[PDB]
Design a protein around this nucleic acid. Structure first.
Length: 51
DNA sequence: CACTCTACCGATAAGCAGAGCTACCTCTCGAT
């Protein structure tokens, strides 16, 4: 596509049935600087959903 | 001086109970 030149190799090409799986990156991405701690250990809490 | 007859510590298993069982991560759901 960049040059319009043919590819030296031919490409296996055609329809195939593909699935959209439940795993999406913006449901997983997570970062923590500081945030909440456990009352008993004062160590950071567990889980994306709790910071 | 040839006998048993019992108090020893070996060396046996011998039976047992418990101690342990990859790393990190996601989400939903129920009970207190």
């Amino acid at each position: 596509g960049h040059t319009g030149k043919k590819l030296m190799a031919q490409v296996f090409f055609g329809p195939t049935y593909y699935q959209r799986l439940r795993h999406m990156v913006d449901d997983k991405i997570h970062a923590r600087a500081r945030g909440p701690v456990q009352v008993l250990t004062r160590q950071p809490v567990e889980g994306r959903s709790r910071d």
